[PDB]
CSV table of C-alpha atoms in Angstrom, one decimal:
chain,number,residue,atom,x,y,z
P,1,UNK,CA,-9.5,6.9,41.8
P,2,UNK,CA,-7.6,5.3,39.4
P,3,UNK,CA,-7.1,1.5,37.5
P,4,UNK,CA,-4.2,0.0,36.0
P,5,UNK,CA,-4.7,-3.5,34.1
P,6,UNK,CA,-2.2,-5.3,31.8
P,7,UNK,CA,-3.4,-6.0,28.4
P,8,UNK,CA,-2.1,-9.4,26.6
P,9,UNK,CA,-2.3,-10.2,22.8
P,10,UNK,CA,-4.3,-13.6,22.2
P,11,UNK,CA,-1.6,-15.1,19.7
P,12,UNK,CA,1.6,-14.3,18.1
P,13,UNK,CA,0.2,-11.7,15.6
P,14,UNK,CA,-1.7,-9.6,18.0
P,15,UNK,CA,-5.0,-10.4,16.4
P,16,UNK,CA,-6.2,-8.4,19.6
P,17,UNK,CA,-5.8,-7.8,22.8
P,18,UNK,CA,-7.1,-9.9,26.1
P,19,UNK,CA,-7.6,-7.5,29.6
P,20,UNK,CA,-8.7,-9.1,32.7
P,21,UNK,CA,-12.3,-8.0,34.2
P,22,UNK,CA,-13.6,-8.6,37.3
P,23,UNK,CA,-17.5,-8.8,37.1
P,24,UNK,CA,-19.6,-9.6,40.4
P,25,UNK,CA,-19.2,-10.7,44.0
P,26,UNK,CA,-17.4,-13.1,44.7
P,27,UNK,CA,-15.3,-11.7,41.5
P,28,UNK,CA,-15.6,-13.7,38.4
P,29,UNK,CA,-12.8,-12.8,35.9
P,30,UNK,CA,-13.3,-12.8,32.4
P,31,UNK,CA,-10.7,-12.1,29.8
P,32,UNK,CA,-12.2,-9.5,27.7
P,33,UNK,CA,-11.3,-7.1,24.4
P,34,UNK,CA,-11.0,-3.1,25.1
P,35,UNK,CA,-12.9,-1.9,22.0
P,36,UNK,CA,-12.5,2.4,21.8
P,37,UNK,CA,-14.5,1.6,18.9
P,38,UNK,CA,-18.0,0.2,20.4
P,39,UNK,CA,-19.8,0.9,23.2
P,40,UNK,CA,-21.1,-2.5,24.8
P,41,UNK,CA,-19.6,-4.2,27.8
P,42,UNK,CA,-21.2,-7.9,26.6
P,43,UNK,CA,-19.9,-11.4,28.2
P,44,UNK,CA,-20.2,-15.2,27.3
P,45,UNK,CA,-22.4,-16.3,30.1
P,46,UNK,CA,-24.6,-19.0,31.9
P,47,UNK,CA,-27.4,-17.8,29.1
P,48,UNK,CA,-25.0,-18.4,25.5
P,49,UNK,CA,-26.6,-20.8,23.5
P,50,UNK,CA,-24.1,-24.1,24.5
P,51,UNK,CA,-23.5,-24.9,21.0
P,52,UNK,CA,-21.7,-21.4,20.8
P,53,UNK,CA,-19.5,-21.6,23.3
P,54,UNK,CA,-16.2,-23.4,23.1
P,55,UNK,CA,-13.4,-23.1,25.9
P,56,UNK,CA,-14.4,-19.4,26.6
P,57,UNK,CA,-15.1,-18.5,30.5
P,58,UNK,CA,-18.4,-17.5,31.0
P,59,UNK,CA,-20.8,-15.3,33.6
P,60,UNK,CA,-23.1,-16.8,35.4
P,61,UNK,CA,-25.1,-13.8,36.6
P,62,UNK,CA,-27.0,-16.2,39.3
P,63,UNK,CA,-23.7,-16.9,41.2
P,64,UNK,CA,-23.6,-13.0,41.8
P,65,UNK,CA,-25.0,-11.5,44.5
P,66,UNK,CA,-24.7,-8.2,43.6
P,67,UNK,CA,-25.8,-9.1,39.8
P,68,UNK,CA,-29.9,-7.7,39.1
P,69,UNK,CA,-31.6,-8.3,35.3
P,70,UNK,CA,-32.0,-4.9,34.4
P,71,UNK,CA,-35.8,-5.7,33.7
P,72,UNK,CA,-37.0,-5.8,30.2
P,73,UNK,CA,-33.5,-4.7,28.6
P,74,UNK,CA,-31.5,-6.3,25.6
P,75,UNK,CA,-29.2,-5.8,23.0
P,76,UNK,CA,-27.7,-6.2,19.9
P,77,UNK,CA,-25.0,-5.8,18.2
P,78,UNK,CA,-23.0,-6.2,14.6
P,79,UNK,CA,-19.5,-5.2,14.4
P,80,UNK,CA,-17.2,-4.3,11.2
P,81,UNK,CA,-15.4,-7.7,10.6
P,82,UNK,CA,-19.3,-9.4,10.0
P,83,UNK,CA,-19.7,-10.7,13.5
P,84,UNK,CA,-22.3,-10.1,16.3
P,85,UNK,CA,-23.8,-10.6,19.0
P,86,UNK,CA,-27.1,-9.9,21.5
P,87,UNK,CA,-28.7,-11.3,24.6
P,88,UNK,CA,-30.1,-9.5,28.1
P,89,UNK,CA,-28.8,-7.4,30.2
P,90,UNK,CA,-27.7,-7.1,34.6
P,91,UNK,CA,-26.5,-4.7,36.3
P,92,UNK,CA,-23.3,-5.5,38.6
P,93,UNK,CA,-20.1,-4.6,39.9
P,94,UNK,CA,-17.0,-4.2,37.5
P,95,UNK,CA,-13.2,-3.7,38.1
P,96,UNK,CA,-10.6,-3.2,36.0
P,97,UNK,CA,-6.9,-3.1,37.2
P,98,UNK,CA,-8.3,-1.8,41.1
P,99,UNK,CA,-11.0,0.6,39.6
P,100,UNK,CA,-14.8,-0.5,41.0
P,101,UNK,CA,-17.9,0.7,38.8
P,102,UNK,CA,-20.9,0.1,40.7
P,103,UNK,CA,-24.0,-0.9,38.7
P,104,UNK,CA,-22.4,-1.4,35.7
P,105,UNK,CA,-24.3,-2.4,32.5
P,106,UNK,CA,-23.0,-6.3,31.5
P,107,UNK,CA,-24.8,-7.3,29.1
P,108,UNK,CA,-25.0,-11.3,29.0
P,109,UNK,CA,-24.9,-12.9,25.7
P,110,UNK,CA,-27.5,-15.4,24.3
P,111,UNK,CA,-26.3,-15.7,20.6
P,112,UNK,CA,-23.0,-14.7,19.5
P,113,UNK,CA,-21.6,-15.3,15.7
P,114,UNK,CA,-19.5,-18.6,14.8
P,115,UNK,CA,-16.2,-15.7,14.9
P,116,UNK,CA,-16.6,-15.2,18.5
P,117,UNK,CA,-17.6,-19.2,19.3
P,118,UNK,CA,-14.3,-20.1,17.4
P,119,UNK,CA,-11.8,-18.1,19.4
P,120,UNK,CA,-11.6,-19.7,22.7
P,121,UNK,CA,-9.5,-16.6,24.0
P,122,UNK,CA,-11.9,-14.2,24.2
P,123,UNK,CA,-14.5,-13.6,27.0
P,124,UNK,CA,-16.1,-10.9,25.7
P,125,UNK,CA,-15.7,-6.9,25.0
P,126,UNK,CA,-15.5,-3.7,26.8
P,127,UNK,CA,-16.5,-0.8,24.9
P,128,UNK,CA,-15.1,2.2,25.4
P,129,UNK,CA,-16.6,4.3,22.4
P,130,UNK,CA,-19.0,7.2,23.1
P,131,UNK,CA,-22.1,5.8,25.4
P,132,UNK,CA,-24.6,7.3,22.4
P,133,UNK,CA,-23.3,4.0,20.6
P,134,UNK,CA,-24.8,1.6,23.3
P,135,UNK,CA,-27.2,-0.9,21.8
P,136,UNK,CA,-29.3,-1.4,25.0
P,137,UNK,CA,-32.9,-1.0,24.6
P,138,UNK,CA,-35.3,0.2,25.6
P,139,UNK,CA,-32.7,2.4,28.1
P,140,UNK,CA,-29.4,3.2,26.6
P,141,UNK,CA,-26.7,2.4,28.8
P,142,UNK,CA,-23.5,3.8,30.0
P,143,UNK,CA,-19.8,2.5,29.1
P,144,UNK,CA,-17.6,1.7,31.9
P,145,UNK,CA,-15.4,5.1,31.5
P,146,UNK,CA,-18.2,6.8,31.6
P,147,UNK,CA,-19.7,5.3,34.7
P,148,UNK,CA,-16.1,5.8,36.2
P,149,UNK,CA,-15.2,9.0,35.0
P,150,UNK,CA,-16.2,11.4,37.9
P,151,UNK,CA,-14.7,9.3,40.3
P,152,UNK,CA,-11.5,9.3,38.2
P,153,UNK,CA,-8.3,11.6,39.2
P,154,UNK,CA,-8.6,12.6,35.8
P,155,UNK,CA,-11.1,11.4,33.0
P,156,UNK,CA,-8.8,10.1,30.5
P,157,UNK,CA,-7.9,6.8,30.0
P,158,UNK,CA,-4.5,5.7,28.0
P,159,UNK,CA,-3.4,2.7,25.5
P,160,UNK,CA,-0.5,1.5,25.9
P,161,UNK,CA,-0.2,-1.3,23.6
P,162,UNK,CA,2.7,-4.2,23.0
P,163,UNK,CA,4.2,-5.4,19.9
P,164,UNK,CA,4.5,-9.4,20.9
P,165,UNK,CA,4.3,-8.3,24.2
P,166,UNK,CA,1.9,-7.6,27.1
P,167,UNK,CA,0.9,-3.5,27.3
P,168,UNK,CA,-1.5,-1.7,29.7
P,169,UNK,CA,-4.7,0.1,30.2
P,170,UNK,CA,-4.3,2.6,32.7
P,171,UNK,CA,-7.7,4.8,33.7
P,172,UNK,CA,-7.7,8.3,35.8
P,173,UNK,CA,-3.9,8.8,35.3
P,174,UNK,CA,-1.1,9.6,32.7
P,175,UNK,CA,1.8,7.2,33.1
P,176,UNK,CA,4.5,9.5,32.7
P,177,UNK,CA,6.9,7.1,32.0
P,178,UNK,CA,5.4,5.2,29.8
P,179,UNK,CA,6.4,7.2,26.8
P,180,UNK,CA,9.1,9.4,25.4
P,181,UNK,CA,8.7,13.2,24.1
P,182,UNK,CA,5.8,15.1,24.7
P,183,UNK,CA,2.1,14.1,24.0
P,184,UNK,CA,0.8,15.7,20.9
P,185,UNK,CA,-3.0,16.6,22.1
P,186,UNK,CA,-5.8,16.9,18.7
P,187,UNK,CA,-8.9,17.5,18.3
P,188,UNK,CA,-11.8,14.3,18.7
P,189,UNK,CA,-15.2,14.5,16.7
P,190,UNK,CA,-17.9,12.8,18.8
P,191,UNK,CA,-20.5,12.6,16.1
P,192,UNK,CA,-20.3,9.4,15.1
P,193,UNK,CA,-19.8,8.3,18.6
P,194,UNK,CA,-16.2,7.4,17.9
P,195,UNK,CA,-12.8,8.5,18.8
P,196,UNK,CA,-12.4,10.3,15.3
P,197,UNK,CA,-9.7,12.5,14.6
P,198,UNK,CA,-7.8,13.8,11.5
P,199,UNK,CA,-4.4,12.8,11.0
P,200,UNK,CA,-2.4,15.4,9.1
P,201,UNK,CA,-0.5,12.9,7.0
P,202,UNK,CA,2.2,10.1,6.1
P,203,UNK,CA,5.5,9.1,5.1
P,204,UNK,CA,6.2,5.1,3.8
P,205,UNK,CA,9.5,4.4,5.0
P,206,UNK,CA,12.4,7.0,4.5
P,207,UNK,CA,10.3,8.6,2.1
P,208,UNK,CA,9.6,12.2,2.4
P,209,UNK,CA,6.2,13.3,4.5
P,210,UNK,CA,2.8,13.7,2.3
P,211,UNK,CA,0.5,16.7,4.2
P,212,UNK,CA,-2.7,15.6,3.9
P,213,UNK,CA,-5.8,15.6,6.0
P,214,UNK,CA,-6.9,11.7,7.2
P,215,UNK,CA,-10.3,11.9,9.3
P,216,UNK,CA,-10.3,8.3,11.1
P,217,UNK,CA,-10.5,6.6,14.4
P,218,UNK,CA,-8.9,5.5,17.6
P,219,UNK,CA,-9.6,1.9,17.2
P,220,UNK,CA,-8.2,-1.0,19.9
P,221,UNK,CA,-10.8,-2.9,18.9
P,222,UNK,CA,-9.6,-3.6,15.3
P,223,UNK,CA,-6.4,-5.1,14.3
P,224,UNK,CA,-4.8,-3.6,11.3
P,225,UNK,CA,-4.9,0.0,9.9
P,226,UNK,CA,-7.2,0.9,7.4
P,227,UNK,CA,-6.8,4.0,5.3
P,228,UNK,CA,-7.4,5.2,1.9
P,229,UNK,CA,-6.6,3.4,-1.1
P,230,UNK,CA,-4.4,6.1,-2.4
P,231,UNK,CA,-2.2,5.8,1.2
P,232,UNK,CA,-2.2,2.1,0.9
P,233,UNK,CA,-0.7,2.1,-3.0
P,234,UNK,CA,2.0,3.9,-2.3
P,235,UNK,CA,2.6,1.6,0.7
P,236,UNK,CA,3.0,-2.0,-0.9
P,237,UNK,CA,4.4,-0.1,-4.1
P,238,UNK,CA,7.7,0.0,-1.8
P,239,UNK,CA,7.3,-3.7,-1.4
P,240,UNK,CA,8.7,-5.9,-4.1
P,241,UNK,CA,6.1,-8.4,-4.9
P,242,UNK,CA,3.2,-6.8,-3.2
P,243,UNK,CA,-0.5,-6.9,-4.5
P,244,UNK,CA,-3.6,-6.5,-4.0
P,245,UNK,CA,-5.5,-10.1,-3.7
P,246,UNK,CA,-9.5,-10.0,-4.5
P,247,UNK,CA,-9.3,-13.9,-3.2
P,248,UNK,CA,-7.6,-13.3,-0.2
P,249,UNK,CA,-9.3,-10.1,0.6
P,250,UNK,CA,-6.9,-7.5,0.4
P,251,UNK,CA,-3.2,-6.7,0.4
P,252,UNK,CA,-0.5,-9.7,0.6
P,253,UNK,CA,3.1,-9.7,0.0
P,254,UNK,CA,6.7,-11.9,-0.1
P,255,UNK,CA,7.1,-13.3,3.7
P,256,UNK,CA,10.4,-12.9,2.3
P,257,UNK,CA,10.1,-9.0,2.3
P,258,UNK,CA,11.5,-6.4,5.0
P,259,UNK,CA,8.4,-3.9,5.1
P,260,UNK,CA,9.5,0.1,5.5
P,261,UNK,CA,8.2,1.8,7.9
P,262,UNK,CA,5.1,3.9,8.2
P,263,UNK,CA,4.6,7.5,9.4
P,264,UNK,CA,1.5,8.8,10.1
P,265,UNK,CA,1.2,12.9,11.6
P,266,UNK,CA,-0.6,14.1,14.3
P,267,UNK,CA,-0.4,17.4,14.3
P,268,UNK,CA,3.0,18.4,13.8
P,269,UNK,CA,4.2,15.6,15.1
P,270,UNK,CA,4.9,11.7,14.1
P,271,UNK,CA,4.3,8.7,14.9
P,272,UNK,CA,6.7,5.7,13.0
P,273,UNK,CA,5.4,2.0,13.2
P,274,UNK,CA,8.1,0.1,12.2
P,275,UNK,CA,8.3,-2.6,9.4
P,276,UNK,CA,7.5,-5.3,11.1
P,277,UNK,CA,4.5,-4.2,13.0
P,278,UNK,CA,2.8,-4.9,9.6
P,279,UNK,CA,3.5,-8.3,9.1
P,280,UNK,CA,0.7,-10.4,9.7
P,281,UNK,CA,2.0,-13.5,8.7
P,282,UNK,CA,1.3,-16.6,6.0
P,283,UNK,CA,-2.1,-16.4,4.7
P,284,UNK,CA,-2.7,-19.9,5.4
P,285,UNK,CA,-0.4,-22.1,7.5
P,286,UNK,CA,3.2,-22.8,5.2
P,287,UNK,CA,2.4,-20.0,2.5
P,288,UNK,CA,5.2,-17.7,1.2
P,289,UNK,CA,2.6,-15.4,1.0
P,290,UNK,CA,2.0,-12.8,3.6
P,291,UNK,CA,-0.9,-10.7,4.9
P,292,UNK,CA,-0.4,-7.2,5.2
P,293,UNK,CA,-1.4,-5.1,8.2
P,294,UNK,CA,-2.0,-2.0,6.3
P,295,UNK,CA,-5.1,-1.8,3.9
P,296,UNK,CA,-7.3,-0.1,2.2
P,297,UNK,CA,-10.3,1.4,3.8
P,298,UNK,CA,-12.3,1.9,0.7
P,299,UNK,CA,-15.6,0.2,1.3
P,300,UNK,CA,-15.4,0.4,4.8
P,301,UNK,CA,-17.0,4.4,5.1
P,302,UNK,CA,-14.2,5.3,7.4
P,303,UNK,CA,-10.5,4.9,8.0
P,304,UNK,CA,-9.5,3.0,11.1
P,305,UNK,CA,-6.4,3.2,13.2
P,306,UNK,CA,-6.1,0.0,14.6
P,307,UNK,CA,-3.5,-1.9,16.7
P,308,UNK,CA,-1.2,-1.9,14.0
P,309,UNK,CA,-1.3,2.0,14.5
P,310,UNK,CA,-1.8,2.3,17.9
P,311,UNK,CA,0.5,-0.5,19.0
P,312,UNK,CA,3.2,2.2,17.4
P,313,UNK,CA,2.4,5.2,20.5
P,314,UNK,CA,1.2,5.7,24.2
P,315,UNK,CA,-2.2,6.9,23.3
P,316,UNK,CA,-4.3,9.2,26.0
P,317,UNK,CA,-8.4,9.0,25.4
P,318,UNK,CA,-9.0,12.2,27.5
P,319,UNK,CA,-13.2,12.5,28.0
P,320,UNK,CA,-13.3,16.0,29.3
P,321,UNK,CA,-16.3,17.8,28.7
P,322,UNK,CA,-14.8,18.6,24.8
P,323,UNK,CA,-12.6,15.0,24.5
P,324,UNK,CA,-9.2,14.9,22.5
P,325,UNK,CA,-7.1,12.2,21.5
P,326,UNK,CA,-3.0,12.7,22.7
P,327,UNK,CA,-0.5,10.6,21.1
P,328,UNK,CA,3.0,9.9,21.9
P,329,UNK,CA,6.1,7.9,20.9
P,330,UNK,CA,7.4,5.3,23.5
């Protein structure tokens, strides 16, 4: 089998990305986030504390007759930006894009942070980490891909994400079309549970390439790209007016600025996200001042290639029995 869904950014600076999600019978459809970089499939629902819920579409389990409380069960979970969430958990059916997992963990959310109450655009998330990152307890639970994958044509699923513009998640098939060159393939550490991989460098703008070794992850789940200070210096030093803000929380430049480019290597090849992929607009509505979508990792524990990175390249998750990442240009 195979899926193919279209993914949407949620506003005009791809803060993330939106997927539709068809969850029970009859199908309710919620709008959720494809996270590579967490392993829960949680949704607003009948059971969120009403004071937490503003505008977002919820499941109500009890309107599904295929929907069973997977007795005793619940979860938890805090993600990098500060936020979380926890609640109960059913089993029922999911689809995404044409592909049907049976018995799917959804785990229905009782409490979820003010970040998640205050954007009205997102349903919930789909994680598509490693399943040894599931927070169910006291039985662990399996991600969607992994529930799918034997049933797959292939068990890989691919990123295809827009710049201001819609993209797609395609599962059980590379899209051959959907990119240009070849897929560079590299190696994935599971250990952490993530999509972790080592970039082999960078270039800022025309600049000439650095070799060097950048362990990180495969992130759709976070918006910018995260990576050692060092990287990130010589960055904004190519931006005039640049700096790092303590008040703002990181990196902010001139909205008055053309940003360079930035190169990052896999394997022996590149991939180039241009300038204004980086731009993530006035720090508050009217500034001059800009937030930047590169920044430093430091204090995070790990770099992250986020949408900003990803956003750049057709990106293949492949979860055979010793998973790689692929990357290509498009």
């Amino acid at each position: 089998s195979t899926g193919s869904a279209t993914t949407t950014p949620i506003d005009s600076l791809d803060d993330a990305y939106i997927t539709p999600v068809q969850i029970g019978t009859p199908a309710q459809t919620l709008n959720l986030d494809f996270d590579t970089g967490s392993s829960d499939l949680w949704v607003f629902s009948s059971e969120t504390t009403a004071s937490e819920v503003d505008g977002q579409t919820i499941y109500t389990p009890s309107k599904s007759t295929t929907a069973k409380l997977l007795s005793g069960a619940t979860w938890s979970i805090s993600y990098g930006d500060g936020s979380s969430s926890s609640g109960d958990v059913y089993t029922d059916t999911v689809s995404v894009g044409g592909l049907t997992v049976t018995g799917q963990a959804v785990e229905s959310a009782k409490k979820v942070s003010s970040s998640f109450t205050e954007d009205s655009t997102i349903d919930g998330l789909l994680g598509l980490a490693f399943s040894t990152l599931n927070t169910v307890s006291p039985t662990q639970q399996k991600t969607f891909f992994d529930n799918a994958k034997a049933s797959l044509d292939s068990p890989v699923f691919t990123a295809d994400l827009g710049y201001h513009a819609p993209g797609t998640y395609n599962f059980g098939f590379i899209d051959t079309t959907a990119y240009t060159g070849s897929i560079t393939y590299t190696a994935v550490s599971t250990k952490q549970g993530f999509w972790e991989w080592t970039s082999t460098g960078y270039a800022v703008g025309s600049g000439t390439f650095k070799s060097t070794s950048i362990d990180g992850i495969a992130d759709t789940g976070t918006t910018l790209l995260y990576l050692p200070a060092t990287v990130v210096s010589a960055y904004w030093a190519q931006v005039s007016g640049a700096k790092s803000s303590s008040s703002v929380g990181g990196y902010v430049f001139p909205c008055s600025a053309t940003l360079p480019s930035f190169t990052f290597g896999v394997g022996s090849a590149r991939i180039v996200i241009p300038g204004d992929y980086i731009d993530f607009g006035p720090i508050s509505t009217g500034s001059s001042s800009c937030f930047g979508g590169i920044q430093s990792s430091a204090g995070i524990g790990i770099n992250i290639f986020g949408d900003v990175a990803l956003k750049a390249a057709f990106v293949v998750f492949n979860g055979a029995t010793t998973p790689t990442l692929g990357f290509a240009s498009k």
